[PDB]
Design a protein around this nucleic acid. Structure first.
Length: 269
DNA sequence: CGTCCAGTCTAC
DNA sequence: TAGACCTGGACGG
């Protein structure tokens, strides 16, 4: 996911788990190289927040739950295919690598971290990844300032399309978003990043917030009340640039495809 | 059958 | 920097 997907995933955990109690251990699949979660409680609640391209779960035992335990926080990065599903315990999807089991009474469910390609990670601290800048959705002013006060950084020597994937400065922006942001302003993707940002000290940094916010406001992205194909219709409709007919595409220097209209820009391959 | 395509992370 | 990390779906032969 990108920032929107991580944000909706955290909203899904919050609404779906609002009225559930979990019990027992946190089960990791055998094949996952991520760490075992050392956590057990007779009764705990699960809640979530997103920052950029990370999601933090908090495991919160109820009063008197046993064995005595403090709340535990886990931070997830989703990679290409990470997600959360709430499923009936004996219909686990394939590639459910981390499971949280509801406690009785009621229908026995599992909250699953599901990750086909296993690019996703999680860590035992609750800490956000040091080096990631502020969330473009939830920390706009901090995000904007952190870019504008570090324009000398060699990160801004690169093309604007490459700079926009640098999670030190645009935590939450990924490949579809960089195409959608740059198309809204018709900024050539291979313009020098420092050139587009010096010109700023509704601009590019504001759309780094408002464009991803639009996706959040659509809802869906796997987390909606509407069907899987229904939310996917709404998203494909909203996209104006990414993989759309009549648009150009090039490989950036890490081989990631950038979609654009018109002038590729000066630093183009 | 085969190829190609869809965000870090780490060893050069 | 360039390759590694993975699975599956679309498409070509």
């Amino acid at each position: 996911g990108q920032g929107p997907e991580l944000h909706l995933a955290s909203q899904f955990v919050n609404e779906a788990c609002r009225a559930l109690v979990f019990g027992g251990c946190v089960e990791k699949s055998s094949v996952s190289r991520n760490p075992e979660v050392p956590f057990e409680s007779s009764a705990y609640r699960i809640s979530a927040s997103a920052r950029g391209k990370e999601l933090r779960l908090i495991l919160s035992p109820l009063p008197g739950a046993q064995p005595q335990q403090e709340p535990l926080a886990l931070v997830f990065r989703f990679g290409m295919s990470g997600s959360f599903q709430l499923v009936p315990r004996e219909e686990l999807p394939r590639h459910a690598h981390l499971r949280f089991y509801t406690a009785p009474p009621g229908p026995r469910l599992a909250l699953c971290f599901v990750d086909i390609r296993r690019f996703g990670r999680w860590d035992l601290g609750g800490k956000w990844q040091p080096g990631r800048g502020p969330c473009v959705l939830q920390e706009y002013q901090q995000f904007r300032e952190n870019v504008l006060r570090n324009l000398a950084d060699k990160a801004f020597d690169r093309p604007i399309c490459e700079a926009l994937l640098d999670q030190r400065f645009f935590n939450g922006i990924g490949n579809y978003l960089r195409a959608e942001i740059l198309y809204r302003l018709k900024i050539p993707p291979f313009e020098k990043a420092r050139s587009v940002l010096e010109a700023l000290q509704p601009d590019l940094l504001e759309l780094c917030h408002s464009v991803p916010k639009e996706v959040v406001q659509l809802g869906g992205r796997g987390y909606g009340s509407e069907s899987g194909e229904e939310d996917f219709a709404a998203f494909r409709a909203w996209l104006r640039c990414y993989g759309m007919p009549g648009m150009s595409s090039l490989q950036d220097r890490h081989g990631r495809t950038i979609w654009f209209q018109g002038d590729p820009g000066p630093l183009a391959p």
